[PDB]
């Protein structure tokens, strides 16, 4: 939108990029407090072990 | 408050370009469609975000005492003097830098000129009357000023010799307390 007129693909890509941005904002929100000292990676090796791939915004969109 | 006039901003930018390297970086628009602006309240100029200024207009003139970072003041004769409050911007985008050891860093805070017996690092090819921000050995911005000689003359200079003219230092925070 300055190409073709393919609005269905336009809308689908807009929705996909929206979901990508939302999921990026989600991880960073839960990232803040994760001590990643170079000699201590316990928290990062745990990150979200206790979540399943329908909870993330991309998981919801993909399902 | 009131925005700066053309001649006033010309003077302020002259001093800021005397001390700094890039200024379109300062006046560049940001990610959220916001930019930094210049405002004058009681012959003081304040570097502040446009959103903060537009939300600060609700305050009556007699009741606004500060806004953003105070760069300096316009004097009665119409000249701009920069401040230790404006030091952080200078550290961010400084043109010339001078590192001082502890033996001169403490005197600089007490309010003394920088000496060759104090200098610990130079910036190569510094002209005579240029803009140099004074840091310590820990890369902590300590002040700013104008240097006395060039790099070659400073090297050839007596170690008990003036290399920088003090103009502002962090000790004034111990004053306005």
């Amino acid at each position: 939108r300055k190409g073709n007129k393919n609005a269905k693909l336009g809308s689908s890509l807009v929705v996909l990029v929206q979901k990508l941005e939302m999921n990026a904002k989600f991880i960073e929100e839960r990232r803040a407090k994760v001590d990643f000292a170079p000699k201590d990676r316990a928290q990062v090796d745990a990150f979200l072990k206790d979540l399943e791939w329908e909870k993330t915004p991309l998981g919801a969109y993909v399902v | 408050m009131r925005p700066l006039t053309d001649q006033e901003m010309k003077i302020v930018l002259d001093k800021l370009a005397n001390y700094m390297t890039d200024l379109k970086s300062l006046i560049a628009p940001l990610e959220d469609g916001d930019r930094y602006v210049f405002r004058m309240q009681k012959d003081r100029v304040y570097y502040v975000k446009l959103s903060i200024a537009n939300i600060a207009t609700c305050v009556a003139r007699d009741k606004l005492l500060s806004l953003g970072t105070c760069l300096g003041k316009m004097t009665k004769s119409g000249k701009f003097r920069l401040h230790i409050t404006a030091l952080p911007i200078l550290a961010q985008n400084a043109r010339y830098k001078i590192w001082v050891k502890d033996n001169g860093a403490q005197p600089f805070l007490y309010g003394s000129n920088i000496v060759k017996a104090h200098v610990g690092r130079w910036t190569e090819d510094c002209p005579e009357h240029s803009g140099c921000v004074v840091y310590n050995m820990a890369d902590i911005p300590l002040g700013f000023g104008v240097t006395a000689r060039s790099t070659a003359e400073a090297r050839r200079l007596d170690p008990t010799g003036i290399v920088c003219f003090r103009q502002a230092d962090c000790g004034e925070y111990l004053r306005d307390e």
Binding site: - | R2, T5, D6, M9, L13, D14, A17, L23, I27, R35
Partner: protein, 88 residues
Amino acid sequence: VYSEKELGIPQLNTVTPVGVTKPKGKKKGKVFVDDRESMNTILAMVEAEKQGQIESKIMRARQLEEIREARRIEAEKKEAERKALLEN
């Protein structure tokens, strides 16, 4: 040495125009500079006089050209504002 502002020296018309003068000891309208375009124009000018002499001709041409570009953008912004406030 005494200042020409201290002395009541009338303005003289040269190649540089005098322009519309204003009465002495009266209200001179403050033209507020707040637009990014005018800021760019002033900032580019200040950098030009600060850098000064450059050996390369293309360097000189590009410095003058960026000043010219800033002035054109500033003038275009003012013309757009004028049209906006005149029609709408």
